[PDB]
């Protein structure tokens, strides 16, 4: 028989009905390492847990991608003026503070 958190009631024979209830007893580990805390929540609303974790992961990846995309754009804007006619970068004295030192120099 399934016994969801709400509980169930079985009526075997003429015996009076008996009611049971299931506690929140997921496997995994309580407060602790994240790879063990998602497991503890996976078991309580498995569909909700997996939906949340992917949402968090995707948003984090988007933010990381945006930051990297932002950093490269800054390098493009900063390095284009220096290298149009001349090869000059103030060899890492002003090549660091303003933008990416990654010019060949």
């Amino acid at each position: 028989i399934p016994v969801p958190v709400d509980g169930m009631e079985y009526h075997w024979g003429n015996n009076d009905p008996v009611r049971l209830w299931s506690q929140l007893t997921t496997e995994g580990k309580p407060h602790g390492w994240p790879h063990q805390i998602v497991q503890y929540y996976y078991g309580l609303y498995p569909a909700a847990t997996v939906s949340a974790v992917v949402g968090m992961s995707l948003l984090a990846l988007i933010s990381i991608f945006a930051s990297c995309y932002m950093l490269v754009a800054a390098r493009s804007k900063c390095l284009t003026p220096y290298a149009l006619t001349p090869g000059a970068a103030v060899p890492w004295t002003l090549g660091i503070l303003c933008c990416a030192p990654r010019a060949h120099a």
Binding site: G7, E9, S22, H31, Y40, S67, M70, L71
Partner: protein, 437 residues
């Protein structure tokens, strides 16, 4: 002093209302339901009981010609034949050789005994709550019957309670029900005067004592076989009996929300649905003067151990600093926890222990000892039984609270990414900046 609160309509849930009257010591007023009858109004559409086929002895006016004397009994069927030769034991039944008629007649009627067997066919439309509540504030420990419709104002030693209308109007009974002996089926019975043979309502009495008996049952006679005096007939078996065999699953075994069903005053009891608003008026005699209640200072939580089990699986001890000894209220303003004790005994030593149940790994609820406050926290653990025989004693709130280990980690990760994004924004702004001016 008016005070309006809402309790969960769950039998055996120790709700604890906390009234804060300024100029008086706060009073915790714990109350809980014990049974909630949900009786709907009925209209007896008709009564169905196993029929009985009355077959009066044939009237063989042989050596002549009998005529079909029609009647008006329920599903009355009169048939007249010709050229029949009864053989009532000991020889022929009359001196003729032919030209004889048998006046067979048969009709339906309610069973000899169905004041003890009838199966009602009520039509319930409107519900009407009725609940028994036990409330113990200070020292009254009393239980009262009340109509939960917002119109019954029960008085319990002073204080006046009015249990407003139930939040939800859900009713397990459909528009049409059927009550046989101890079960209330959600059938869809045919309307009076439109039953069909074999199924429910073949014989429909408008009332147990009334006599109308629309008993459509397809009673049909047949020509008696030669040489005997029987009265053959072919009738569809008791439609009521067929319903008894094929009734299906009664509502007593599929009612939502664990609603137990009682028949005689047809009703659903212990329906754990919705919230019961409660408005209470109290006399100032019930309260306690602040100048008399002990004062509490420097209140702080410390949870020795929290296991968010169904019962009170969390213990927290409050250290304080009082001026005298006595008793006064304790209550958790937040709902993520539910205290077991209501009034704790305050002593000179700054240590009082309390028990609380919860359902969140990292609950955060500001307890209120006597008159002060202290934000509270705990790193709760999950139990390992998978099964318990008692109902949950905690409002099913599982979402954690910020500063919890689970939320702290996402806070840590989110902040780091935000700072990284902010740094990139600042770098880009400076880059575009130095390009403009």
């Amino acid at each position: 002093y008016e005070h309006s609160t809402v309790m969960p309509n769950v039998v055996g849930f120790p709700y604890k209302a906390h009234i804060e009257r300024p100029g008086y010591s706060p009073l915790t007023l714990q109350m809980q339901v014990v049974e909630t009858s949900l009786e709907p109004t009925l209209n007896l559409e008709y009564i169905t009981c196993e029929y009985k086929t009355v077959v009066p002895s044939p009237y063989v006016k042989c050596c002549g010609a009998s005529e079909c004397s029609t009647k008006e009994k329920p599903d009355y069927q009169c048939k007249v034949y010709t050229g029949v030769y009864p053989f009532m034991w000991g020889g022929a039944y009359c001196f003729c050789d032919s030209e004889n008629t048998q006046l067979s007649e048969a009709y339906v009627d309610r069973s000899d005994v169905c004041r003890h067997d009838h199966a009602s066919a009520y039509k319930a439309h409107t519900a009407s709550l009725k609940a028994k509540v036990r409330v113990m504030y200070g020292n009254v420990n009393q239980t009262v019957d009340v109509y939960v419709n917002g119109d019954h104002a029960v008085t319990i030693g002073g204080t006046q309670f009015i249990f407003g209308p139930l939040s939800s109007a859900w009713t397990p009974f459909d528009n049409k029900i059927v009550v046989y002996k101890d079960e209330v089926f959600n059938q869809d019975f045919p309307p009076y005067g439109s039953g069909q043979p074999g199924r429910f309502g073949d014989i429909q009495s408008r009332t147990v004592e009334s006599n109308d008996l629309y008993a459509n049952t397809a009673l049909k006679l047949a020509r008696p076989s030669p040489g005997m005096v029987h009265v053959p007939y072919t009738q569809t078996p008791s439609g009521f009996k067929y319903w008894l065999k094929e009734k299906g699953t009664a509502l007593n075994t599929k009612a939502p929300f664990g609603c137990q069903i009682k028949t005689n005053p047809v009703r659903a009891m212990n329906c754990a649905v919705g919230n019961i608003p409660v408005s209470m008026n109290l006399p100032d005699s019930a309260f306690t003067r602040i100048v008399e209640a002990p004062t509490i200072i420097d209140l702080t939580c410390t949870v020795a151990t929290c296991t968010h089990s169904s019962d009170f699986g969390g213990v927290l001890t409050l250290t304080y600093k009082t001026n005298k000894n006595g008793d006064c209220s304790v209550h958790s303003h937040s709902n993520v926890a539910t205290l077991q004790e209501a009034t704790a005994k305050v002593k000179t030593a700054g240590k009082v222990t309390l028990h609380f149940s919860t359902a969140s790994a990292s609950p955060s609820f500001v307890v209120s000892l006597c008159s002060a406050r202290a934000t509270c926290s705990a790193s709760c653990e999950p139990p390992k039984d998978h099964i318990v025989p008692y109902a949950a004693s905690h409002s099913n709130v599982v979402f954690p609270d910020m500063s919890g280990t689970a939320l702290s980690w996402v806070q840590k990760i989110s902040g780091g990414l935000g700072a990284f994004a902010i740094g990139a924004i600042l770098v880009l702004v400076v880059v575009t900046c130095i390009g403009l001016r």
